Amino acid sequence: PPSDHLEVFVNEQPVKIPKGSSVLQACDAAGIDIPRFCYHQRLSIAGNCRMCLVEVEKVPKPVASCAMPAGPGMKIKTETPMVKKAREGVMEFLLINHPLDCPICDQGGECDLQDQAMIFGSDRSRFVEAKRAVEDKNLGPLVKTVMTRCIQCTRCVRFASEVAGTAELGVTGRGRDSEIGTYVEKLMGSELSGNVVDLCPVGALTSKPYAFTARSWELKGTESIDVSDGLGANIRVDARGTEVMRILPRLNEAVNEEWLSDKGRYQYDGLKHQRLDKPMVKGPKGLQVATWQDALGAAAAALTSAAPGEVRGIAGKLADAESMVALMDLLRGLGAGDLAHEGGFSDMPADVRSTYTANTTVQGLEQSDLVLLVGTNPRWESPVFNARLRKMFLDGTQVGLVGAPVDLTYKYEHVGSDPAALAALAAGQHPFLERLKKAARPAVVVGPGVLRRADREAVMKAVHELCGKAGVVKEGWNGFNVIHDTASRVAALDMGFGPSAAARARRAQGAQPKVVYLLGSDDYSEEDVPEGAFVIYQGHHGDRGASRANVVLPGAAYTEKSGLYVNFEGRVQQTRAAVPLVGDAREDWAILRALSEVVGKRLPYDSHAAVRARLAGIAPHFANIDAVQTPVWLNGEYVKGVEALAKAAPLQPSAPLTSTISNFYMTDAISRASRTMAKCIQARQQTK
Amino acid sequence: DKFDYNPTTIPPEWHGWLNYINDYNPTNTQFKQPTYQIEASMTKTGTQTCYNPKGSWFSAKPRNWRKYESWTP
Amino acid sequence: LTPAKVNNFTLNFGPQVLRLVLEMQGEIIMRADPHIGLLHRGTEKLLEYKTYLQGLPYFDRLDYVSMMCMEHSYVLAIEQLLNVSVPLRGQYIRVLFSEITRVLNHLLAITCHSMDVGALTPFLWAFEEREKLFEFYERVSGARMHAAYFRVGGVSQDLPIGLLRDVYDWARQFASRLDEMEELLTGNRIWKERTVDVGTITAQMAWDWGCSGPILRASGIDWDLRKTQPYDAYGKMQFNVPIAGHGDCYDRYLVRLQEMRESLRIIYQCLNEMPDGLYKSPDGKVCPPSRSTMKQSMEALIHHFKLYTEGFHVPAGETYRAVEAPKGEFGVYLVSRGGNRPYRCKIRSPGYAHLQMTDVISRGAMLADVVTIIGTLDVVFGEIDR
Amino acid sequence: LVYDIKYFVRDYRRNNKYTARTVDAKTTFDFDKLYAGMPTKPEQVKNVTRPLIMPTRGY
Amino acid sequence: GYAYARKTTDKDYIASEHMQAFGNTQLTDYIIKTVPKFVKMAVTGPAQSSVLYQEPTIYTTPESLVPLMVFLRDHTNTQFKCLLDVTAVDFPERAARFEVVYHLLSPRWNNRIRVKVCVDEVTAVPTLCKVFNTANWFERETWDMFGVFFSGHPDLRRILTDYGFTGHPLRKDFPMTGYQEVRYDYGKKRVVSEPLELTQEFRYFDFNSPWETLNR
Amino acid sequence: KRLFGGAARHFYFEICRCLPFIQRLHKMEEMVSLKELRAIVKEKFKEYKDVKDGRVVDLLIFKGREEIETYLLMHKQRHHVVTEVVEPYYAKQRAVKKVTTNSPFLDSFLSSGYAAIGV
Numbered sequence A: 001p002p003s004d005h006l007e008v009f010v011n012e013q014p015v016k017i018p019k020g021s022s023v024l025q026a027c028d029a030a031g032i033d034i035p036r037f038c039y040h041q042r043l044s045i046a047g048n049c050r051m052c053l054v055e056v057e058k059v060p061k062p063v064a065s066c067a068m069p070a071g072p073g074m075k076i077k078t079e080t081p082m083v084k085k086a087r088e089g090v091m092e093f094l095l096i097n098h099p100l101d102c103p104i105c106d107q108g109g110e111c112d113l114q115d116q117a118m119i120f121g122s123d124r125s126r127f128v129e130a131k132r133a134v135e136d137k138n139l140g141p142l143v144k145t146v147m148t149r150c151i152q153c154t155r156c157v158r159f160a161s162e163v164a165g166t167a168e169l170g171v172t173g174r175g176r177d178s179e180i181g182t183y184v185e186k187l188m189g190s191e192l193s194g195n196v197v198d199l200c201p202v203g204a205l206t207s208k209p210y211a212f213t214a215r216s217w218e219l220k221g222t223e224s225i226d227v228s229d230g231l232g233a234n235i236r237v238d239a240r241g242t243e244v245m246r247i248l249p250r251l252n253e254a255v256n257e258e259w260l261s262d263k264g265r266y267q268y269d270g271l272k273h274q275r276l277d278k279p280m281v282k283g284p285k286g287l288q289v290a291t292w293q294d295a296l297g298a299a300a301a302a303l304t305s306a307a308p309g310e311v312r313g314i315a316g317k318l319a320d321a322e323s324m325v326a327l328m329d330l331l332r333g334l335g336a337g338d339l340a341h342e343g344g345f346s347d348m349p350a351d352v353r354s355t356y357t358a359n360t361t362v363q364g365l366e367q368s369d370l371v372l373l374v375g376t377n378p379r380w381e382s383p384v385f386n387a388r389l390r391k392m393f394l395d396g397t398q399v400g401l402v403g404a405p406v407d408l409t410y411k412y413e414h415v416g417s418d419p420a421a422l423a424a425l426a427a428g429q430h431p432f433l434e435r436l437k438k439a440a441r442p443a444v445v446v447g448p449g450v451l452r453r454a455d456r457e458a459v460m461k462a463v464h465e466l467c468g469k470a471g472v473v474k475e476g477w478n479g480f481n482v483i484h485d486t487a488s489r490v491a492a493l494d495m496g497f498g499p500s501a502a503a504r505a506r507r508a509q510g511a512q513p514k515v516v517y518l519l520g521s522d523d524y525s526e527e528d529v530p531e532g533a534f535v536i537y538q539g540h541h542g543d544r545g546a547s548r549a550n551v552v553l554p555g556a557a558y559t560e561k562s563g564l565y566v567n568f569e570g571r572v573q574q575t576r577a578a579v580p581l582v583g584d585a586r587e588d589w590a591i592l593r594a595l596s597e598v599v600g601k602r603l604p605y606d607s608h609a610a611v612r613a614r615l616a617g618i619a620p621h622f623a624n625i626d627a628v629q630t631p632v633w634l635n636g637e638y639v640k641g642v643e644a645l646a647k648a649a650p651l652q653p654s655a656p657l658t659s660t661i662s663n664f665y666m667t668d669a670i671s672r673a674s675r676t677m678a679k680c681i682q683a684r685q686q687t688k
Numbered sequence B: 001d002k003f004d005y006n007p008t009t010i011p012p013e014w015h016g017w018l019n020y021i022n023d024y025n026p027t028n029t030q031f032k033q034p035t036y037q038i039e040a041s042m043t044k045t046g047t048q049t050c051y052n053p054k055g056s057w058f059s060a061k062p063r064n065w066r067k068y069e070s071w072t073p
Numbered sequence C: 001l002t003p004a005k006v007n008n009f010t011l012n013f014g015p016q017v018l019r020l021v022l023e024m025q026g027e028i029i030m031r032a033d034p035h036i037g038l039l040h041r042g043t044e045k046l047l048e049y050k051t052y053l054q055g056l057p058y059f060d061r062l063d064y065v066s067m068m069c070m071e072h073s074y075v076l077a078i079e080q081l082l083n084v085s086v087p088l089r090g091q092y093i094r095v096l097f098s099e100i101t102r103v104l105n106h107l108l109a110i111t112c113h114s115m116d117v118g119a120l121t122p123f124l125w126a127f128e129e130r131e132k133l134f135e136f137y138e139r140v141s142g143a144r145m146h147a148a149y150f151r152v153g154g155v156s157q158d159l160p161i162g163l164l165r166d167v168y169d170w171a172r173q174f175a176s177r178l179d180e181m182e183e184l185l186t187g188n189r190i191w192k193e194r195t196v197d198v199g200t201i202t203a204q205m206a207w208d209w210g211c212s213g214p215i216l217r218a219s220g221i222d223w224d225l226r227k228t229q230p231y232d233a234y235g236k237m238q239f240n241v242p243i244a245g246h247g248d249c250y251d252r253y254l255v256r257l258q259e260m261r262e263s264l265r266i267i268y269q270c271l272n273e274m275p276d277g278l279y280k281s282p283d284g285k286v287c288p289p290s291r292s293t294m295k296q297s298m299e300a301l302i303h304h305f306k307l308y309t310e311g312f313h314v315p316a317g318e319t320y321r322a323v324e325a326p327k328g329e330f331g332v333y334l335v336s337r338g339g340n341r342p343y344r345c346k347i348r349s350p351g352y353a354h355l356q357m358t359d360v361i362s363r364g365a366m367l368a369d370v371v372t373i374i375g376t377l378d379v380v381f382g383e384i385d386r
Numbered sequence D: 001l002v003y004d005i006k007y008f009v010r011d012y013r014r015n016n017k018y019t020a021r022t023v024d025a026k027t028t029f030d031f032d033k034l035y036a037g038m039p040t041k042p043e044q045v046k047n048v049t050r051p052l053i054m055p056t057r058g059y
Numbered sequence E: 001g002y003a004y005a006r007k008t009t010d011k012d013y014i015a016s017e018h019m020q021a022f023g024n025t026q027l028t029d030y031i032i033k034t035v036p037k038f039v040k041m042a043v044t045g046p047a048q049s050s051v052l053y054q055e056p057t058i059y060t061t062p063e064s065l066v067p068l069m070v071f072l073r074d075h076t077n078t079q080f081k082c083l084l085d086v087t088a089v090d091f092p093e094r095a096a097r098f099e100v101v102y103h104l105l106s107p108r109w110n111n112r113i114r115v116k117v118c119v120d121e122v123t124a125v126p127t128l129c130k131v132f133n134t135a136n137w138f139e140r141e142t143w144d145m146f147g148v149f150f151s152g153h154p155d156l157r158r159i160l161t162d163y164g165f166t167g168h169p170l171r172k173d174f175p176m177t178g179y180q181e182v183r184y185d186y187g188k189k190r191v192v193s194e195p196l197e198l199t200q201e202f203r204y205f206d207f208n209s210p211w212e213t214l215n216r
Numbered sequence F: 001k002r003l004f005g006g007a008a009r010h011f012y013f014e015i016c017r018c019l020p021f022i023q024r025l026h027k028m029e030e031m032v033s034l035k036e037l038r039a040i041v042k043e044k045f046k047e048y049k050d051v052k053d054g055r056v057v058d059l060l061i062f063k064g065r066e067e068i069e070t071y072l073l074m075h076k077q078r079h080h081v082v083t084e085v086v087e088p089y090y091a092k093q094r095a096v097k098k099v100t101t102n103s104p105f106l107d108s109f110l111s112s113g114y115a116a117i118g119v
């Protein structure tokens, strides 16, 4: 190569840097953290803060390292008297108009401005004049705006324009009277609208739900994962004692970079309401507080009183792999084979992991210049994934959609809306095929709502046909991908949590069980939960399933334990306990093991590591935490092996490929109990 | 109060002159009286009418300081 | 490896906070084994979880007889690693109040020694001047004992107007109070016969036994940290050094009295040389700014926010500094990792070293003299047990 | 310092230095020069005066 | 014994010029040249004695600590007759987690010094009682607070913790409040240690900014 | 002839030699004999039967010397004997053959949401 890595000198240190890198990036590679205010890793170069000024030989003026490209043979100095003089002057110019709001500002303790002033600034001020007074702005109930604190670092504008794609914010006025916000009273319609406060380096933009609640140092930080969807964003949990105070995203380039859905940002409030703390057993007067011994005995009697074919188990959205496998072992050990999943398509065959995962991976998806969407809405299925899709769109990647035309914050081509359009595209009737047939790295992605169709085999067969015709899967590349919207689905698929053929037939003729057990499920259909049937519920929130239940075991929430959760690409991730158990709650797999012992068939494991090892024996990849395997590919042999399922229940060419997600702000009980999501819903309803 | 003399009944505006902290008294200094000013009186320590924390058994309505709501059927 | 066998003599001297076990072949002491730790509060580990400013009050309660001296060593140890210069007026105030603190320590020590010996009048008499100096302390810091006045780079507040007037007024008669104090014991045959030639110590043993303060001076040893390794404005001060050559309890008594005289002389010299100027170091990045400055300036407000929450970050390193305490040489070893909390803060106490001399000194003595040994040792278990 | 508020000229704290000197193995310590600078008579004896105060740097 | 009162007049001076200049500039080099085997590492530090000078610090194996201390007390140029204290520092990151510290004072020449030996939990440290009487209680306290053993000691036993206390509280891994708390029980009529319990648990605050450069 | 010279057996023999004086001085005539006292001391040794460093064993023996010595000078009062010596023996011989038929895992589940810690 023509020396892709050029050489410069920073304070007489030779550092090898890639071509096109900036002096900021070079100094970062040099081990120096230059003060900066407007530059960000994920945004365009703004270069208005003037805080990145450095000294270069043969240059009389300080240069903008946040923007200055590095030339070969360049010399960079960072500790000269002029450097410190410029830094102190810039800090002084920052602080002259800034209001003395630190005691009331919520960013005190984690304010970049404050620390940078402490380090690179002076201690005294010679400004004694009247400051500039700025009125606050309304953007919705999620973000509290104190505009007088704004330093005009323009990060909000760049973020809204590029990542969100809404481009609803701008700079009004001029000079000192330059103003930030919207000229009109507008509500921030961005779904990833909470990232701006984190991106705001000052207290000008603050989380309204978090305002004046607690301080940064009062918190204990626990790195966690997001369970509100199937992407599994890496997050950190901040708490004061047993109470969650705020949840913040953390860096994971291969999953979510530095971004979090506002649904995954503000749903922590629900953990304070409708909480189940004590076991309940339905008496003649109704459900009453009873001991774990009494509840477990009642559950064992109810389970043993019925035949094995009259017991059904259902897994919710937020059940972990450990509890799922424990309950599956429990029900299998008693001759029961009725399994169901709250995430749908519980009867979908799961023999090859690639058939129900994203084989391109999330970061490998960025290598594709052409992307095909088949009946999915990534904006409401995974807004972080939609943001990454937009980032891919920003550098030439074209996207096609087959399904309902919806706002996706970037231009795209609508091929069609029904399976007939997909068949026409596969036949050669549409120009999009030739664009697919000419793309070097084409990509096809299918959502979970397609898997909820009764004709899912036919849709999969058509998709496989199109992939074969366009060569989407070939040597060294796999553009075929399967996504999801719930965490517990992937672990259930990998562990084989699927109903028996006998139970499928029993549903076919209409057999109705009598013992029904819920593992944190609240969005069941009426057909799987007959009325008049005994219900044993395990959960951590009082909701519809809890109300109809007859015996209730207060379980553990994802913020209180460490459960295994694998995202739709097949990467194993685990949560982490940030606060202790609420009330008399117990460990979910411990609860199931206790029930197994009480009934009369003990589970062979007695520890968390033991059940995880049982999972590993069931599927080896469970051991690899925070990694992913390359799934095997079996070409059209799988499709030709599931041809009978295609023959039965033939294709429906009329039903549109829609998204089953109709309420972004409310998908589970925790979302259904969160006050903040309800406030956002009312705000979106008060605009008309 | 000849039988139950107690220093707590001395008003603060005489407390400073009594304690040799200032040379100001009501007879020669006109202080500013807030509208929310509470007068001085005897202590109630040792009695059942004295102050108690909100989690005390003597409180009018006991407080359960659990930071969440329990679900009721 | 060792049995008990012969029980024979057995003694228990006091759970009430010194515990003493002695060994006599009769009326004469042959062995004396103190047991300590009844006041060990584990402060040194506790220091690690506190900021430098947070941990400052810990040093108030190490020697609750002499406080500002305890503050001064830790403050100097911080500042030397911080490379901070102290203003002149602050040094004057520090030296003057340190002399007053030394006077208090000497007064209380001598009075307690007398009461243990059997004289009760000087106890009560000197506690009146002790109350006067407590009033002085309260006027300047709002606390009678635990002032927390000394600060990194100076002091918390300047002296209130009219204080030096009363200081001079007190000094105008403190000499008379000391004179009337002496006549009760100085010319007494009983006080001498109780104190003369009891607990004799040599220079060689003392330097072997790590003595400091007045005990060292009574062995014919020319040593004052204020004259050999001066700190702050002590180099400018001119005063004498009492010297004795017997190592006797009476000698230590006279040495402490003459030390009080010299302290009064230094108090006078400080009173007539008080300068006008700044009392805190002008580095706001370490020293807190004025409240008026804080409430009208963004930068001082930010520094007040940061220092009062996180505090200044001492550069990584190590140092040990000592101060000529009234009970000896009080030193603190500071270990810095670079953060806003001291990594390891070891505290050296002179009384702890002096307390180690009991067994060898009490040999050949009588039970009437153990109390004499303890009283003349001038030991506070707060510094001994940290 | 009321109007001249520059700090780098007076940041003693963050400007101290430690250096790892060379390996002090093949050095020549001439004690002759050490003892040649010492007095030999009652006179010619010089003593370092006790400093009056610690540095103040103008304040 | 030294530092005897010789002059009847006031002294306006500290030490002699040549001796002070040597002790402040070439003392470390003299130590290095004299006993290089006893020397392992050299640091000249912030001058414990005074804020305006330099003073050395000594690192060596525990093997030669005793002869090194003997020379440092007994050498005609280094009359360090006062051993201030013996303590230790915990370095859990290192293979040897303990840095025992030795401080000396030389009233003969108004100087001071620091001596350090780095050891682990299972290596003996020869006692300095034969060199200094005061080392007895300092070794006792160091053992009580860290478990640093001292071979050949007359009687090495705890001096500051509880009578039945096991463990060394100044260790970095040792909990701030510990494991056991003690209370009196009416039923047994005895004061008994019980598992530690707190009405309000301790609050730890993270103030350390992500921008500070001095962190080491 | 024995592992690490068998210093452990010498330490146990020394403590057993010193044992009866403790029983007489601390009025354990009406609670224990020499035999079960020796059994208590033996069970104390079993806590570290699997240590593989002679140095660690030496330091264990030294700390045990300190414990037995502070036992010898009566520095630990009768309450220490109550809380560590004879009541633990009474509990050990008292809760023998308990009537609970549940597994320890189920016992922990019926106990609390966390395992018990400390004595």
Ligand code: SF4
Pocket: A098, A099, A100, A101, A102, A105, A106, A107, A108, A109, A111, A113, A114, A149, A201, A202, A203, A204
């Ligand atoms: S943004 Fe930072 S500097 Fe500005 S008022 Fe808030 S805490 Fe203070």
Ligand code: SF4
Pocket: A149, A150, A151, A152, A153, A154, A155, A156, A157, A180, A199, A200, A201, A202, A204, A205
């Ligand atoms: S509001 Fe915040 S993000 Fe926007 S320009 Fe101002 S400081 Fe930057």
Ligand code: FES
Pocket: A036, A037, A038, A039, A046, A047, A048, A049, A050, A051, A052, A053, A064, A065, A066, A067
């Ligand atoms: S980052 Fe360089 S001026 Fe903004």
